[PDB]
Design a binder for this molecule. Sequence first.
Ligand SMILES: Nc1ncnc2c1ncn2[C@@H]1O[C@H](COP(=O)(O)OP(=O)(O)OP(=O)(O)O)[C@@H](O)[C@H]1O
Ligand SMILES: Nc1ncnc2c1ncn2[C@@H]1O[C@H](COP(=O)(O)OP(=O)(O)OP(=O)(O)O)[C@@H](O)[C@H]1O
Ligand SMILES: Nc1ncnc2c1ncn2[C@@H]1O[C@H](COP(=O)(O)OP(=O)(O)OP(=O)(O)O)[C@@H](O)[C@H]1O
Ligand SMILES: Nc1ncnc2c1ncn2[C@@H]1O[C@H](COP(=O)(O)OP(=O)(O)OP(=O)(O)O)[C@@H](O)[C@H]1O
Ligand SMILES: Nc1ncnc2c1ncn2[C@@H]1O[C@H](COP(=O)(O)OP(=O)(O)OP(=O)(O)O)[C@@H](O)[C@H]1O
Ligand SMILES: Nc1ncnc2c1ncn2[C@@H]1O[C@H](COP(=O)(O)OP(=O)(O)OP(=O)(O)O)[C@@H](O)[C@H]1O
Lengths: 377, 726, 569
Amino acid sequence: FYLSPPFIFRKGSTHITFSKETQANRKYNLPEPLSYAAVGGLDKEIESLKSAIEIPLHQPTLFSSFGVSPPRGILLHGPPGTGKTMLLRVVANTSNAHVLTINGPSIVSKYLGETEAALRDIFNEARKYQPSIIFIDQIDSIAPNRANDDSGEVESRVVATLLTLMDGMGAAGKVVVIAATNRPNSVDPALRRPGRFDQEVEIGIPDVDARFDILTKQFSRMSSDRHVLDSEAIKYIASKTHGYVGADLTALCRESVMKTIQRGLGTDANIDKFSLKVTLKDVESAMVDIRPSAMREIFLEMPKVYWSDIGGQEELKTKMKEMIQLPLEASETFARLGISAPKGVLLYGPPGCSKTLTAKALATESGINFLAVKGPE
Amino acid sequence: KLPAEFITRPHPSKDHGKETCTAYIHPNVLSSLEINPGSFCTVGKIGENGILVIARAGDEEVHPVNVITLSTTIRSVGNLILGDRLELKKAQVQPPYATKVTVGSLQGYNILECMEEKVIQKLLDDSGVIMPGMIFQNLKTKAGDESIDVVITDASDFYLSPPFIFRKGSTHITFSKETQANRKYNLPEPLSYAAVGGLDKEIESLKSAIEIPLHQPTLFSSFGVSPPRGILLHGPPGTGKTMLLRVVANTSNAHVLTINGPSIVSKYLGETEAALRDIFNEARKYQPSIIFIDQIDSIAPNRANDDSGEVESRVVATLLTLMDGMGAAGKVVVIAATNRPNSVDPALRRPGRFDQEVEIGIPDVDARFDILTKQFSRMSSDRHVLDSEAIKYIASKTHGYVGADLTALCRESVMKTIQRGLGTDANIDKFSLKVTLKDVESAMVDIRPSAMREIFLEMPKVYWSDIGGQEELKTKMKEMIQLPLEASETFARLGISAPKGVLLYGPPGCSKTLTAKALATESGINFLAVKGPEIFNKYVGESERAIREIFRKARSAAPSIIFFDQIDALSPDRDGSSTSAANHVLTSLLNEIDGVEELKGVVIVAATNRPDEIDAALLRPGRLDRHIYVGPPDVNARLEILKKCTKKFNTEESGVDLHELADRTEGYSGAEVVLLCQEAGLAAIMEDLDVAKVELRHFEKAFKGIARGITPEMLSYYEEFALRSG
Amino acid sequence: FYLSPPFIFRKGSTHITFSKETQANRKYNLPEPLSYAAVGGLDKEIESLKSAIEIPLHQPTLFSSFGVSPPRGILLHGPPGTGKTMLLRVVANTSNAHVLTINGPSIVSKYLGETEAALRDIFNEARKYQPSIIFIDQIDSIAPNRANDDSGEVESRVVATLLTLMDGMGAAGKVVVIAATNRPNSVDPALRRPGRFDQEVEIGIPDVDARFDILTKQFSRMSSDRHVLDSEAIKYIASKTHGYVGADLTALCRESVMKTIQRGLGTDANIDKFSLKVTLKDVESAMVDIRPSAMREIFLEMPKVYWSDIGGQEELKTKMKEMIQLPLEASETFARLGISAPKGVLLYGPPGCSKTLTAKALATESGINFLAVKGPEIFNKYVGESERAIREIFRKARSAAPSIIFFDQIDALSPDRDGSSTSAANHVLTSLLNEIDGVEELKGVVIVAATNRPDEIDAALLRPGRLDRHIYVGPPDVNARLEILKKCTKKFNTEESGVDLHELADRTEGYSGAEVVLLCQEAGLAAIMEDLDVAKVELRHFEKAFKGIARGITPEMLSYYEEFALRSG
Ligand SMILES: Nc1ncnc2c1ncn2[C@@H]1O[C@H](COP(=O)(O)OP(=O)(O)OP(=O)(O)O)[C@@H](O)[C@H]1O
Ligand SMILES: Nc1ncnc2c1ncn2[C@@H]1O[C@H](COP(=O)(O)OP(=O)(O)OP(=O)(O)O)[C@@H](O)[C@H]1O
Ligand SMILES: Nc1ncnc2c1ncn2[C@@H]1O[C@H](COP(=O)(O)OP(=O)(O)OP(=O)(O)O)[C@@H](O)[C@H]1O
Ligand SMILES: Nc1ncnc2c1ncn2[C@@H]1O[C@H](COP(=O)(O)OP(=O)(O)OP(=O)(O)O)[C@@H](O)[C@H]1O
Ligand SMILES: Nc1ncnc2c1ncn2[C@@H]1O[C@H](COP(=O)(O)OP(=O)(O)OP(=O)(O)O)[C@@H](O)[C@H]1O
Ligand SMILES: Nc1ncnc2c1ncn2[C@@H]1O[C@H](COP(=O)(O)OP(=O)(O)OP(=O)(O)O)[C@@H](O)[C@H]1O
C-alpha cells in the first residue's frame, strides 16, 4: 500500500550520494512518464499533431492577429493497434494543460437528461481553465451517424448537444479536443466539419522503415545489457515482419522475452531469470510462433511442406520466386528502374500436378501472410 | 432568495454623460454577498474571468432582484447582449494609476474635436473607473447631423483585461486612429453585417423580418394581419446560419435567450415543460425578446416515425401550445435553425407560426468570391499580399467550398506560410511572414472539401501525359468537363447545357479506368467512384438508400464527375431470372439521372466491357450521350507508352531505337506493352542482380512470353457494334 | 394588463356622440365576432352542414315518434389547412348558445379511473347543461383505428364508453356533438358504423370559383382602404397557383403586406406605413417567395415547362387534354349523366419519346401542382414501413383538383420475378391493388403512369378499370421534328447562316426529339469550341454532329410495341 513509501529528511544523516541514472529504481514499479521519443516512424504526423495542439493552446495571439479562428477538434483514425491511444497518452503527459478523461460511453446514463448534463459539466470545466484538452476515445459509438435508421433518439440528442457545445452561440476559448476512433465512417458527418474537426490525421499501417524505427526505439527503451543485437539484425527482423504493427512488435518482443526465460530454465535448473539475454534466433522463433493481428480472423492450417518437397520443373519455381521475393528482398533496384511486380499468375493444367502443393509450400516457406479462398465458398 | 445566475438589461434612462459605469444591485444580494455599494464588483458570463469592477445599489423594489441593469457603454467590453448571465465575485484588487492612454475614433475620420471643451467632462470628469476599451455613442458632437464614435485602444500602467484608474492630471491623452481596440490582449468583438457575404438577398429579408415584428409590431398589425413570429433557417451544415443568428442577436436592441442546446429537457417529468414556460414568460414579460433554437430537429423530432414516441412528442405539443398561446401584442421573434429541413415536425411548419422560411443554398462563384474578399479584408492588410485577381481565381477554383471550408483553407494557408517561413528563414519571427498564393495552393491540396469527407479514395496520381493513347478521347473529355465550367456565359447565351454522359466501351484494360484516374488527378474537381455491384445490400431497399445518398452527396458537392465502373453488372434484367433488386436499382439510377429533377453541373461517366448487356433505357439520349470506341492503341500511342516505360532504362547505352520494337508489337494492347516492359526489367534484374539498362535479349524473351489476349473475334464484335451504332 | 381599460360613465357630466362604423378601434386589441359571411367558397359544404346540424339543433320533433337513431353529428373532415377551425368558431358564435367542450392534446390522466371519469363528468354536464354544439377535434389522435397494435391503447375503452353513452336522450334533445378530424380514413370504422355519421360531410380546398370572392372578403376584413381593389387583378391572382388553400391565401396576403412594408421603408427611409398602398408587384413577389405548405414535405419541384417549349403529334396532346380538363373542371355533369371516366392513362413507348416531359407539361398546364412519386423509393427495409409509406403518399398528400400522382416507372413494381410468398414487392403490389380497386371517381385523381417495358406490367395489375385508355405515344413525325429543330435553333442565327432547317429534318427521319436535341447541343458545343463565341451554326457542325447519334429507334422494339398494342386492343 501507499505506492512508494515516504522518508524523513535530516541535515546530516542523509549522506547524499550522486549516481548516474536518469530513471528511478525499478523495484518500486512506479509509472514512467511517456516521451515523444517513444513513438517512432511517425515523425511527420507527430510534428503535425504537436503543432496543431500547441499553437491553439499557447500564444493564440498569432491567430487573433490574423483574424482566423483556431482549430477546435482533431480526429485521429486508423487500424486498431496502430498507436493512437499511446499518442494521446504521450501528448497528455508532455503538455502541461488540463485534461478531461472522457474515455467512452460512461457519459450516458439511465436518466433522460444525465447524458447531456455530464457533457455540459465536462465542457464547463474545460472552459473554466483556459489551457484544457479533451481526449475522446471511440467517438463512433457515443456519437454515431444520425442518418442511420438505428441511430435512435438519445444518440441523436447527444450528437446535437455535442455539436452545440463545440460550436454555437458560446464560442470555445483556446481549448482543443482530440478524438480517436477506428471507424471514421461511423462518425456523424456533422461532427466532421471544418468548424469542428478540420484537422484530420489518417494514421496508417507502419511500413518497413517505420517498423524498423519502432523496433529500435523499443530496444533503446530496453536496457543495453538485457539483450545483445546489431543494427543490421534489427533491420532484418523489421524486414521479416510484414503485416506487423506496434502492438504486433510489442507482442513479438514479449514472446521473445518469455521464450528466453523458458530456454534459460530448460538449459539451467534453478537459474536466475534476470541474467538471460535475447538472441536473433530467439526473436525468429518468437516471430514464427506468434501470428499477426490481421491474420487472427483467418482460421486455416495445413501440414508443413518445404520447397524441396515439390518434384517438378524449376522454371515455375524460378518465375514465381522472382515474382514474389524480388520486390521485397531488393526493392531499391525496382525503385530505380521504376517497375513493379506483375502481380498475377494462373495455373492451368491436368489436375493434381503441382497447384495445391505449391500453394501449401508457399504458405509454409514464404515468410508472408497467406490467404486461401475457395470458389463457391 | 439566492438565484445562481443573474441576467442583464439596459438602463431605462438614456445616456447623458452621467451615472455611467454603474450597475444597480438589489440590497438583499449585496447583504448576502457582503459587498458594500461602493466597491469594485466584477461580473462574468459563466467563467471567462470577466471583469467589470462596477458596483452600485438598486432603488426600492422596482428593480427586479434577478436582473442587473448594465449601461450600454460599459456592456461593450464584455460583449454582453441584453440577457447574458452574470456571476458575482466579491474578491477584488485595487488597481494602480494609469500613466498612458490613447483614444481612437471608430469612424474613418481623424482629428475631431481637438479642443475637447465638452468632451473632457464626459470621459474624464466621471469618478467611475474606465476600461482600456469600449464603444462610446457620444450622442451628437459634430455639426452636420452626424454622430461619431470613439473607441480607446491602448492603455498601459487572471483577469481578462486589467482596469486602470485615470485622472485628469495623471497624464496626457494621445488621440490617434487605430480602428478598434488593439489585439495584444484578447477581447471579444461584435459581428456586423459585413461579416456575412453572399447572402444579401436573404440578409435583407432577415433584417426586415427581425426589425418589423420587434420595433413596430402594432404599426405592422394596423393593416389587419398578424405579424410573423417564427423564422426557420435550413440548409447544408456549415453554411452560416449560426453566424447570421449571432449577428442578428448582436445588432438588435432586444433580449436574446439561448435555448439551442438540449439542456431544456430534464430528468424530472414536469421540469422539461416548466423550464420552457419560465423562459417564454421571461421573454414576454420584459417585452422586446428574440428566441434562438438551433438543432430544432433534435428538440422537435417528426411525429411520423416511431422514434418520437412519448417524451419528445409531448415536448413538441407543449412548444406548439405555448407558441400559439402568445398574441400579436408583444414583440417576440422565434428563430429556428436545423441541418435537416425535413426532420422538423410538420405541425410547427405552418403559415400561422412558421410561414417565414428562408433556404440557404451552396454558395456559387460570386458568393465564394465575396466571402473570400470579406475574409481577406477582415484579415490584416499587411499580413496578405494577394490582390483581387488572385482572390477571384482562387474562388473560381473552389467548387464545393462552403464558408466553413473557406475558413479552414485560410487557416491552413496561414499555417503553411508559418511553416515555410520557419523552414526557410531559420527561425525568424512568425508575425513578419505574409501569406502568398503558393501557400494558398498548398492548403487547397492539403484540405479536402467537407462534402467529400464521407468518401475515402486513396488513388495514385496519374497525369494526362502518362496516357499516350488517342487524343480524341482526351479532347472530348476536356471539352465536356472544363469548357462548361470555364465559360458558362457562352453556354447560357447559346442556350445549350452539358451532355454529362460518357459511355466507355472497348477492349478490357486498354484505357477507360485510367481516364477516370487521370481525370480525378488532373481535373481539380470532386471525383466520385461507384462500383457496379458495390451498392447492392442484403436488406430490401438499402441499395435504394445507398444510391440516393450517393446522388445527394454528388449534388451537394458542386458540379462533379461520377464514375460508374462496370455499369453492365446491374443493367440487364430482361426476364425473371434476375432478382427484383437489380431492376429496382436500375430504375432508381434512371430516375436519379433524368427522372423528373434535372441534373446541373454533375457529369456521369460510365465504363463498361459489354455495351450490349446495357439496357436501351440507359442508351437513350440524355443519359450516356457520348460513346467512345477506345480501342487498342495505335503505333504512335504504343511508341509513346514504350518511351514512357523505358525512360528510366538507359536507351542510349543499350542502343535500342524504340521503333523496331514498337512496329513488332502491332497487335498488342496498352497493358500488354507495360507487362512486356516489366518482364524485360525483371529479366535484366535477374541477369546481373543490379543493373541500370535493359538489353535486346530481355525484350525478345518478354515478347516471347507475352500471350495475346485481344482475340480477333472480340475486335470484330466491337466494330460490328460500332457500325450498328453508326 | 387588461383586455380593455375600464372607465366611469355618467348621464349629464359627459358628452355622447355617434360616428364611425361597426368595427371598433384596433388599438384595444379586442377580438371581433365571426359570422357565416366571414367565410366564402366552402359555403357549399356549409349549406349542407348548416342544414344537417340545424334540423337537430332547431326543432328535431320530426323524428320523435320514428324511433330511429338520432342524428347528433356531422363528422367534418378534409385536407389539412382547409379552415375547419374557423367554421367551428363561426357555428359556435352564431348559435348564441352553450359551447361547452374541450379538445386537449390527447388529454389523459395518470390515474386509471380519472382518465375516464373526466369524460364521464364532461358528458354528464353536457346532458345537464345542454350545449348546442360539442367540439371533438383530432379524433384520429385521440381515437384512431384499432387495426394498429399501438393505436388501440387506452383509447379503446374511452371510445367504447363514448359510443355507448352518446346513444341517450332520444327524440327530444339536441346535444349535438361535432367531430372534426384531419385524416378521414384514420377514424375507427366502428365509430363511423352508427348512422349519426351517415352524412360524412367533407370540405374540400377552395378552387376554381369563390377564390376571388374570399380574397376580396379577407381584403375588406383586414382593411377597406390603403389597398388595391381591382376585379381583374384578384381574378388573375386566384387563377394563378390553383393549388393554394385558404390558409395559403392568408399567408400570401401576409407576405404581400410584408413586401409592401419593405418596399415602403426602402423607398421613404422608415416613413409611416399608413399611407402606403398595395400593388401587384409585391403580390407577385410574395407569391414567388412564400413557398407554401402545399408543396412542402417534398423539398423538390419540377422544372418549368410550357407548350411552346414542346412540339409534338397534336393527337396525343388533344387526347391528354380531353382526359384531364373534362373531369377536372366540374363533376355535377359526370355525376348526373353517369359518365365514368377511366381516371388512368398508361404511357408506353420507345425511350426518349418525352412521355415524362408530356406529363410535366400536363402538370404545369392544368394541375398547377405536381406530386412526384418513385416506385422503388417507397420500398423500405422494414416489412410494414413500405405499406404505410405507400398508403400515406396515396391518401394524405392527395388533393382533389390540384394534386396528380405520376409514376416514373410502374413496371418495376408488379413483377416479383422468382417470388413465392412473403415478399416486399408482392406486399406493395397487393396494397396498391387494394387501394386502387376501391376508387372509381372519388375526387378526380386522374392518375398518370409512364413505362418503358410494358411486358412486366401485366402481372396481376392490368384490370378492366385501368386499361380503358391506352396511348401509343409514337415517335415524332417530320412536322414535329421540324418544330423541335426550329425551337432548338431559335437561339442560333438561322438568317445569318442561311440554313432552311428542312433538309436536316428530312435526313433525320428515324430520329426523335431527344436525338435532335442531342445533335443540336453537340453542334453548338463544337461551334463554341472551334472559334470561341460566334453566335451561328454552319452546315459543317451538323455534319460533324451527325455521326455522334447512335443509330436511333431500332425496328425490333417498335414491332414489339406494335404487337403489344394489338394484343391489348
Ligand atoms: N509506434 C509505436 N511504438 C511502440 N509501441 C507501439 C507503437 N504503436 C503501438 N505500440 C504498442 O501497441 C499498443 C497499442 O497501441 P495503443 O494502446 O496506442 O492503441 P491504438 O492503436 O489507439 O488502438 P485501439 O483502437 O485498440 O485503441 C501500445 O500500447 C504499444 O505497446
Ligand atoms: N510434383 C509433385 N511432388 C510431390 N507430390 C506431388 C506432386 N504432384 C502431385 N503430388 C501429390 O499429388 C497431390 C495432388 O496435387 P494437388 O493437391 O496440388 O492437386 P491440383 O493440381 O490442385 O489438382 P485438383 O485440385 O484439380 O485435384 C498433391 O497434394 C501431392 O500429394
Ligand atoms: N458566409 C460566410 N462567410 C464567412 N465564413 C463563413 C460563412 N459561413 C460560414 N463560415 C465559416 O464557417 C463556420 C461555421 O459557420 P456557422 O458557425 O455560422 O455555422 P452554421 O453554418 O450554422 O452550421 P452548423 O449547423 O454546422 O452549426 C463559421 O465559423 C465561419 O468560419
Ligand atoms: N494508353 C495507355 N497509356 C498508358 N498506360 C496504359 C495505357 N493502356 C493501358 N495502360 C496500362 O495498362 C493498365 C490496364 O488498363 P486499365 O485496367 O486501366 O484499363 P480499363 O480498360 O479501364 O480496365 P478494365 O477493362 O479492366 O475495366 C493501366 O492501368 C495502365 O497501367
Ligand atoms: N371561407 C373562408 N374564407 C376565408 N378564409 C377561410 C375560409 N375557410 C378557411 N379559411 C382560412 O383557413 C384558416 C383557418 O385555419 P383553422 O384554424 O381553421 O385550421 P386548419 O388549418 O383549417 O385546421 P385542420 O388542418 O386541423 O383542419 C385561416 O387562414 C382562414 O383564413
Ligand atoms: N416534342 C418535343 N419537344 C421538345 N423536346 C422533346 C420533344 N420530344 C422529346 N423531347 C426531348 O426528349 C426528351 C425525352 O423525354 P424524357 O427524357 O423525359 O424521356 P421519356 O421519353 O419519358 O423516356 P423514359 O421512359 O426513359 O423515361 C425530353 O425530355 C426532351 O428533352
